[PDB]
């Protein structure tokens, strides 16, 4: 795909609300979507000002499955998706009764990928990891890639990891859609490294590194 | 409750996306709080003009407990909860992978209620029921209140019903919370029946009317 | 149905294992169909010797809608089913990871139901309520009945009392089917009460009572 | 382990319930537990006679995580888990309502592995694929592994492939108990290949093997 490059810049655009809180996120980054490698770094600035008022880690993964390093022969349906363009819908269910729905669409223009997302979060218990601000970030990860009704649908048991050493599960599943169809993929594997950094007290300023390949099986 | 009267009137504005539709819906209502009725008319606006994208009846419980029958001795939560005001969150689990997560905000000037929502849908398959609008309303339910981690959690099995006699199941989880500590309820029940009417081919203008009863289990 | 009468008699078998620990139970009651109220005592018999091993509460609603207080007019889906008999299968999704199966068989001999079942637990906490024995029975509930593929569906949210007073949940779902086809059901909502009673130190030896009533909604 | 050896044979027993048919399977294998190999022929024998009632793609995880190739270094929660034993709990989740449980144990003796087995199934649909049997085996798996608690987890979403190339959903979610404390491995990952093969028109007569190693991650 003469259309992606090896690298490319990302800026993102999210407005969202957690538990009755608002707010938005603005982020730019940089990438080598045939290395599969990411960083960016993001703005979270809450409707009522003040610091995050949640886990950033519940929207690291919100923040392009273009950035993954495929064999050269293996139909890439991410990349064969551009120039026209991808949108995402991912369910995040936590085993504590937190739920948390986004989706996002993804554009490209020249060596820039612009994110616009919308975010939204539910019932996560106050005193939970989530709304306590408790984790440190998600486990390294096996995402399985299916073909179901014409699109490609990813499904993880993640575990976002806990302050002092235990683990918190969230069930992911995500729908992958493309605006023209592509050559479609057969059942794969993608793994995950994501690591969020926080860059103030208050976690309003985070980086994001991701690191994701894809394996035949 | 000197602030809840036998009849009150409501506004609303609720931000919304489903499978990556952005919308807005404005609407306006009456209702009789003790009575346990109320009937408002809204109307759908899509970011991209055009009908109503998906079946109404996902938004329809989205659009206030205060209108419920109470035995006059039981502590009513929601009523108590004015005029310092409440907020709802609820979780949208369909059987399809459809789920959806809705929060809301409730306040009271004078006679009037306004509330001020936000709605997000995912994952509903193209061809389901909600995406293709063949439902026709909710099933009368028998929402069980129970109480958790002091405020009123709500827990139904609901079902939607669909155009040929078939039936689709939603499971819903709410969590209501008062702006102020209120004398709490014992666990009880809330009956509901909700209408659904359409004004316009599109379904765009639609009327709804909601009768609730708690009952003392 | 000339077959059920006012006053029968039931005799319990049951096959379990729990958190790898085997037992059976027998039983024998007396209730009134029409009446919708019956009361049995079991003794629980562990693989092992020894005192019951887990809470009987996740087995007591596996011990028949023939006891249901139906309108005379309703088709009453579990009387019509006799004398050819009925089969039961249901499954307990608990809030804390733990999930059982169930499934059992009805027969009938003049005023004599046979009830013979098989019982699975899995995954339940060492810790938690059903393994420590902290629950005291469950809250009285609203099951949901509707008709799905020729079968009648039972669903529900049902929360199980805890010695101190909390609650802990458990989704039920439901499959009643008859041996013959009987005239269906409209959807409809039966409400239940269910009081067990321990009669040993153990809990070993215990007492059920269920009170149901079938309500047209 | 000099417990466990380069070649070892392992003997089955299954007691189980599907949808209410009841059936008993007996079973013998050969594996190689560094190589992470095994194979082994299976007899299921329904109690009404007759051919097997289902897909035994919903049994066949159900007959040993000694076969799995771990780094030399790595602590091998399952290996070292012998002679003393150990113990499995299993909860199969179903898109489409079906749930089975399964629990087991595994005892050793000289080269022998015995394992003895009790699974459950419920609520699946008469005409899905798996009263059908309209599937041909499970696809590729990576399943996490994790510490909570104390014991070691297992979890992953399952595809389980049919006839005509689609896919079905299944969630796994296990408990791996030790007879006595080990040393705990950190979180990782088993990946799994397993293909059943039938060996008479029924499918009563069956052949399964498993090739299975560990990633650490």
């Known amino acids: 795909n003469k259309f992606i490059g090896d690298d490319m810049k990302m800026t993102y655009?999210?407005?969202?609300?957690?538990?009755?809180?608002?707010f938005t996120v603005k982020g730019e980054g940089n990438g080598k979507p045939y290395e599969g490698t990411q960083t960016?770094?993001?703005?979270?600035?809450?409707?009522?000002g003040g610091p995050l008022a949640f886990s950033f880690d519940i929207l690291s993964t919100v923040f392009?499955?273009?950035?993954?390093?495929?064999?050269?022969?293996?139909?890439d349906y991410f990349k064969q998706a551009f120039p026209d363009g991808m949108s995402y819908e991912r369910t995040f269910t936590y085993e504590d009764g937190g739920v948390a729905t986004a989706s996002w669409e993804i554009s490209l223009?020249?060596?820039?990928?612009?994110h616009k997302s919308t975010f939204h979060g539910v019932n996560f218990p106050a005193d939970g990891?989530?709304?306590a601000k408790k984790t440190t970030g998600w486990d390294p990860s096996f995402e399985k890639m299916t073909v179901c009704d014409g699109i490609?649908?990813?499904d993880v048991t993640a575990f976002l990891m806990?302050?002092?050493?235990?683990?918190?599960?969230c069930q992911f599943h995500?729908?992958?859609?493309?605006?023209?169809?592509?050559?479609?993929?057969?059942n794969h594997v993608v793994e995950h490294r994501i690591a969020r950094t926080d860059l103030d007290k208050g976690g309003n300023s985070v980086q994001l590194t991701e690191h994701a390949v894809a394996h035949i099986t």
Chains 1, 2, 3, 4 share one sequence.
């Open 13 to 22: 655009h999210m407005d969202g609300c957690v538990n009755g809180h608002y």
């Open 40 to 48: 960016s770094t993001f703005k979270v600035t809450m409707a009522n």
């Open 64 to 75: 392009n499955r273009c950035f993954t390093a495929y064999p050269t022969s293996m139909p």
């Open 109 to 114: 223009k020249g060596n820039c990928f612009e």
């Open 129 to 131: 990891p989530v709304m």
């Open 152 to 154: 490609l649908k990813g």
């Open 162 to 169: 806990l302050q002092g050493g235990g683990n918190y599960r």
């Open 174 to 186: 995500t729908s992958y859609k493309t605006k023209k169809p592509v050559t479609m993929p057969p």
